[model samples]
Target chain A: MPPRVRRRVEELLRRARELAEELGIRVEVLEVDPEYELELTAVITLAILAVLAPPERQDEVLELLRETLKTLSEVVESLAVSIWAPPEREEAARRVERLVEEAFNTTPETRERARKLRDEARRDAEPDEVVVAVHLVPK
Target chain B: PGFGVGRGLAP
Candidate 1:
């Protein structure tokens, strides 16, 4: 991403974080290490790979985050049930990779663990998949 | 009262 766009996203994310916090959700960045497959956490992602979360505080964290984001008029963006490969594993990719993993691990894993969960949600909202393709449904 | 107005609005 270009510096300007990146900076803008960072700012927007910061606002989202503040909004999360104001609503009493504890949020923070996760650490990235060379070893270990990262787990998902409570961190929220916009349209990028970066993640947001405070892992151990999972109890009330995501409940508040979801409630807050919802009240803020921001639809929780599409997050995967099956964790997609979080960008690359080195350099710039490492930054986003660790971020997303940390976010998922912090949050409840039921939503981001297997594709079936997301698909089931899609099915629950509407019996037809084609309808979903034409609209935005939060899963 | 126009064409595009409320086209995206309700059921």
Candidate 2:
């Protein structure tokens, strides 16, 4: 990833982690390949939107999410990185896009996770409690 | 500091 894009993704992830904490959700960014960082960042952004948006507006946000991913794919191509995913990976990305739409569903597990994070945040009694550590995990 | 896929999706 370019240095500037990497910085933006880091900032975006940081902001989403904060919002997730505020919404009482314990979210973590697992180590993954740097090449897929853009996609992962997009996923985190969608998840944040899922929690921030009201149910009625989730569909709209999800549509935007799809567009954003597509645009990211196109951006990669435009950069002439000479890198592209195979058919299977493309399908996997589409599958993930579809799953993102379901992330906003009001499930019991989702509610519980949020509640636990909220309680933890409260108990910590420190604004720094929500500060998530971020680093590029090399493949 | 605002560019990339996340920038397009930022509210």
Candidate 3:
């Protein structure tokens, strides 16, 4: 991404962190890319990879992030936000890899464990998938 | 025969 473009992306993501942090979600940056942008895509792939959270908080966190992006739809230009169900280990693994990777942090041991879990999730009924995709298109 | 029998699956 161009510097000017990249800066705004950071700024937007920063604001999102603030929102998630207050509500007991450890937000992490999984990926950010100049997507599929002239055909426009400035993507902020966020994750709520924290302690075991229940439905209510998860719902609230997602709600805040979802609405947060939309409220700034016009202001953020081509900002597109993706709220996934946490990601998996490395690109070596998404669908499942992307989602599981976000749930834990640091330590090759932990990563290995998460990777193990990631495979289970892959085979299980809940396939790693996008929960919310918010595109900021303000014309 | 097996190769010809099981090869044309499109859906």
Candidate 4:
């Protein structure tokens, strides 16, 4: 792992632990191979899209997300994106941003033009690029 | 209201 990515992962794990403690719930962190982390990232990205997309547009985004999963599965299987490659990460981010814009524009009043403006307005928002794995256990 | 049945999720 690159030093920066490792630091981000550690920070995320710390926050996850704190939140779990605050809720009085036991949480487990299982570090699989880094490849599994990448795959999980793709799955979580798609899951986010599934939850946020408008009901009418969900089918379209879900279809694209699944396609992305299939492609990512093969990439991970072949060990192509083993670490934080700038192009891969940027491409993923772009896809995520596009889907988010679609979701935001689903409201008729917002429209495509407003969505573009909204994105530009938030252009300086911090990039969120960490993956932390968590499992909530119940007995 | 705890652990097993998911009520622990309540805030």
Q: Which DockQ values do the candidates obtain, in the order shown? A: 0.02, 0.06, 0.01, 0.05
User: Over all chains combined, what TM-score does candidate 2 have?
Assistant: 0.35
Off by over 4 Å in 1: A32-139, B1-11
Better candidate number, 3 or 4, judged by TM-score? 3
Q: Model 1 Cα displacement at A10 (Å)?
A: 0.9
Q: Pick the candidate with the highest lDDT.
A: 2
Docking class of 3: incorrect
Better of 1 and 2 by DockQ: 2
Worst 10 residues of 1 chain A by lDDT: A128-137
In order, the Cα lDDT scores of the candidates are 0.28, 0.37, 0.32, 0.33
Q: Name the best candidate (by DockQ).
A: 2
CAPRI verdict (incorrect, acceptable, medium, high) for model 2: incorrect
Using lDDT, rank the candidates from best to worst.
2, 4, 3, 1
TM, every model: 0.26, 0.35, 0.29, 0.27
The alpha-carbon deviation from the true structure for residue B3 of candidate 1, after best TM-score superposition, in angstroms, is: 47
Q: What is the lDDT of residue B3 in candidate 3?
A: 6
List the TM values for chain B, per candidate: 0.07, 0.18, 0.10, 0.13
lDDT head-to-head 2 vs 3, winner = 2
Name the regions of candidate 2 deviating beyond 4 angstroms. Answer: A38-42, A48-139, B1-11
Rank candidates, DockQ, best first: 2, 4, 1, 3
